[PDB]
């Protein structure tokens, strides 16, 4: 039972990528709409949902078609919040960033011995914008993105 606000969004984004302005979006469009919202279904997992309601040119989904299908992978998840607290933990100093220093740190108390080498390593592969540190944003990506 998505909150109304949680509804405004899906439509504010569903309709942003509804090019031909009607109210049904193409497959590739559905993939787009979602990603923008911070989700990326597999090139094949993107169909099972759109394929679960063939009452169009056996190809698109209306506003509701979508609004409703956002439960199968929605109605049960509330992790976005935990992950944000995970982040707050590593961010030992409260700068809003996660330095390799503190990565290795919290990494050890939890019982793991990381090599000064394999840390500056994670921090790197996790830093997308290249400023050497990871922010909530990139953190979020690293975490969720599978």
């Amino acid at each position: 039972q998505l909150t109304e606000e949680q509804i405004a969004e899906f439509k504010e984004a569903f309709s942003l990528f509804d090019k031909d302005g009607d109210g049904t979006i193409t497959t590739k469009e559905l993939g787009t709409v979602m990603r923008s919202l911070g989700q990326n279904p597999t090139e094949a997992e993107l169909q099972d949902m759109i394929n679960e309601v063939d009452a169009d040119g056996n190809g698109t989904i209306d506003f509701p078609e979508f609004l409703t299908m956002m439960a199968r992978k929605m109605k049960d998840t509330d992790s976005e919040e935990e992950i944000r607290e995970a982040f707050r933990v590593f961010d030992k100093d409260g700068n809003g960033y996660i330095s390799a220093a503190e990565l290795r740190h919290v990494m050890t108390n939890l019982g793991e011995k990381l090599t000064d080498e394999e840390v500056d390593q994670m921090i790197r592969e996790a830093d997308i914008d290249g400023d050497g540190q990871v922010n909530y944003e990139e953190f979020v990506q690293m975490m969720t993105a599978k």
Binding site: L16, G21, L37, A86, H105, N109, E125, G130, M142
Partner: protein, 735 residues
């Protein structure tokens, strides 16, 4: 703090190689003292006169005991001591001369000495016999009345047994001595002069070098913290404001330690402290009735609400009673009401507190009744003698706000079921938060899982793999049948707290019934004072919502303990529609972080619902669609910025490749901002986004090469038709 300040590296290695030789001859601890004393040493170039940045009026020449002799000829000095709050040693050097007749450097020693003197052993810790009985060596202990090398015009007074009787009257003088025993024990030349003439000052100075210096340098260091700390009354001075029953608190003192985790409690009503040690049960989630603070019933949850704090609130009571009634209606057999029975101690307690006034007696239906008095002007109360129950009635000349008028009735209180017997209810121990040690959470995870995780080959996967584990076994909070909302460990903790105040002697169940207020996302309250029991077993209590926050940052946050804060903080708690602030690191770094695709579209959605006008309308206007088409373009760039394949590149590229992606976005925004009419509510947001982008791109630039200001770099861009070469430009733009 760096103590040395060399201000003008003018001479070759000579001024330097001189300041060095100078300092290195001083004990590494004497400096430490100086440092801790918040001191600084100034080795400036040729700055003789009242000329250095710190040599103009402050706390200068007021009285005249100056050099090894009192001489006071300023313009001729090359060394000086800013003597008051924080010591400030200032020395300068011209050409090569400090070693032939070091009778000069000896002033850089005394001049220094005048720092430690009145703040050393001489007076810092008081002249403890150590320095007093050393001054007694005036002429009566050793066969060496050779103290002219430090005592002429102020101690030719051999005709005085110097002891407590007079040593104070001349501290400024019993320093000038400590300034020579020092200037001599370290002077690059004369050192034995001090070991020869006076046999004590030497051994003294010598034992000071043996470690006396590391002493004060440690009594000032430890006090370094204790001095400037966060004002938080500890010990029973707090355990009193706390509210907890001292026995329990102490009981808790164990767990905190065994389990190694801070425990914070919100205020526990004073008016209910003893009702607990007594044996009265505590309020759970099953009851949302209000307590009381006046009369016999005070501290209990009166079934009658007009007998609780909200005395008069025709609705807080109206909807108030409606709560107890439900409390019993739904949770029958577990929650209900029973006659009030103020025992003995309680009575003598509600005494001085002035809640009640036991007085005249009376007789009714054959039984005795001492009358219990209260200034309340609508209810009269009396306790019974056989059973000491408590009764009341709506005075013969008055009424009850709801419109009720009744004669002597028994005062029922709320009571839950404990061991099969309704027991009256009182304030419970509301945990504000629980801060377990990160390592104790480790012990929470099942050896095998955490094992099967670290083995992972992929490094970045290992991290994720772990974080979740830490989320799974330490940050996650599920709801629950009774204990409200809390984490699994949070529960185990909950028991170890209750079974801990159980072995103490409490007979009325648990005292901690639900989860931590940091999960009170619905009706979050903001208490000023928070009682905390650190892992060492030390009671503490803060005074501000700030201090609390500031305390938790210093000890819990930045110190290897897991802590999370109420998800409704900085938001608008639905239930009581409250706005309670809490420093959020993440939000700190927002100011200069480019938004995300989703964070962007999110904000669009919000405003839509706010001004019922979207960034673009569903119309035929072709400038509208432009706007739509254009946001979709930003929703792209922003989305492009945060690309996961950015790893197959190098930190160098990463910044650049993103400083552009970012810039791209900044453009289309500047673009739309200059489009057709876009509601100003949006006009502002887009305005906000700009600064973020700006800020962000600046960060990526100063991180790498410094001169290029965002505004300028922008100018030099060609966003007309071709973007291609523009990027090649950007690269050159950064060289």
């Amino acid at each position: 703090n760096n103590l040395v300040k060399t201000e003008f590296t003018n001479e070759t290695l000579d001024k330097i190689q001189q300041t060095q030789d100078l300092l290195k001859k001083i004990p590494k601890d004497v400096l430490e003292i100086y440092s801790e004393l918040g001191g600084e040493i100034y080795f400036t170039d040729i700055d003789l006169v009242e000329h250095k940045e710190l040599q103009d009026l402050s706390e200068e020449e007021k009285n005249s005991m100056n050099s090894r002799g009192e001489k006071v000829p300023f313009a001729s000095r090359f060394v000086f001591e800013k003597k008051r709050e924080t010591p400030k040693l200032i020395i300068n050097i011209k050409d090569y001369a400090i070693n032939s007749e070091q009778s000069k450097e000896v002033y850089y020693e005394i001049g220094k000495g005048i720092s430690l003197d009145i703040i050393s052993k001489d007076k810092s810790l008081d002249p403890e016999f150590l320095n007093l009985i050393k001054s007694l060596s005036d002429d009566s202990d050793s066969s060496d009345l050779l103290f002219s090398q430090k005592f002429k015009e102020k101690l030719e007074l051999n005709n005085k047994s110097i002891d407590i009787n007079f040593i104070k009257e001349n501290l400024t003088e019993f320093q000038h001595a400590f300034s020579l025993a020092f200037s001599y024990y370290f002077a690059p030349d004369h050192r034995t002069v001090l070991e020869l003439y006076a046999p004590d000052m030497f051994e003294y100075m010598n034992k000071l070098e043996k470690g006396g210096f590391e002493k004060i340098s440690e009594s000032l260091k430890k006090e370094g913290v204790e001095k400037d700390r966060i004002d938080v009354l500890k010990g029973e001075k707090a355990l009193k404001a706390s509210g907890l029953v001292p026995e329990h608190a102490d009981a808790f003192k164990k767990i905190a330690r065994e389990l190694n985790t801070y425990i914070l409690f919100r205020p526990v009503n004073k008016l209910a402290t003893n009702l607990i040690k007594s044996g009265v049960a505590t309020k759970g989630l099953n009851v949302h009735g209000k307590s009381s603070d006046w009369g016999p019933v005070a501290g209990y949850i009166p079934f009658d609400q007009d007998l609780s704090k909200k005395h008069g609130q025709q609705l807080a009571v109206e909807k108030g009673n409606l709560e107890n009634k439900k409390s019993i209606t739904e949770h029958e057999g577990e929650i209900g009401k029973i006659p009030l029975k103020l025992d003995h101690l309680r009575i003598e307690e509600l005494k001085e507190n002035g809640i009640i006034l036991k007085g005249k007696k009376e007789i009714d239906n054959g039984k005795k009744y001492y009358l219990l008095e209260s200034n309340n002007q609508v209810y009269e109360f009396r306790i019974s003698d056989e059973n000491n129950e408590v009764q009341y009635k709506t005075k013969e000349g008055k009424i009850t706000v709801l419109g009720e008028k009744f004669n002597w009735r028994n005062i029922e209180v709320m009571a839950k079921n404990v061991e099969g017997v309704l027991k009256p209810l009182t304030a419970d121990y509301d945990l504000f938060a629980l801060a377990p040690s990160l390592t104790e959470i480790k012990k929470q995870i099942p050896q095998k899982e955490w094992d099967k995780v670290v083995n992972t080959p992929n490094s970045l996967e290992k991290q994720k793999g772990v974080t979740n584990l830490l989320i799974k076994y330490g940050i996650e909070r599920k709801p629950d049948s009774t204990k409200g909302t809390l984490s699994n460990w949070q529960k185990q903790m909950l028991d170890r707290l209750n079974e801990a105040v159980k072995y103490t002697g409490y007979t009325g169940g648990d005292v901690v019934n639900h989860g931590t207020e940091q999960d009170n996302e619905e009706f979050p309250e903001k208490d000023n004072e928070i009682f905390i029991i650190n892992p060492e077993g030390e009671f503490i209590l803060t005074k501000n919502w700030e201090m609390t926050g500031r305390f938790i940052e210093k000890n819990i946050t930045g110190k290897d303990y897991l802590y999370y804060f109420n998800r409704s903080y900085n938001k608008i708690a639905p239930g009581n529609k409250a706005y309670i602030e809490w420093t959020d690191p993440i939000t700190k770094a927002k100011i200069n972080t480019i938004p995300t695709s989703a964070e962007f579209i999110k904000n669009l959605s919000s405003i839509r619902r706010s001004s019922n006008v979207g960034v673009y309308k569903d119309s035929g206007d072709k400038d509208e669609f432009a706007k739509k088409e254009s946001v979709k373009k930003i929703a792209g760039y922003l989305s492009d910025y945060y690309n996961s394949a950015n790893h197959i590149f190098s930190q160098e590229k990463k910044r650049k490749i993103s400083i552009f992606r970012g810039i791209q976005a900044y453009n289309e925004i500047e673009n739309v901002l200059k489009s057709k009419q876009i509601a100003p509510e949006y006009k502002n947001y887009f305005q906000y986004l700009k600064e973020r982008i700006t800020n962000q791109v600046q960060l990526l630039l100063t991180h790498q090469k410094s001169n290029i200001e965002f505004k300028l770099l922008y100018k030099q861009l060609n966003f007309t038709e071709n973007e291609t070469d523009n990027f090649e430009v950007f690269q050159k733009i950064i060289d």
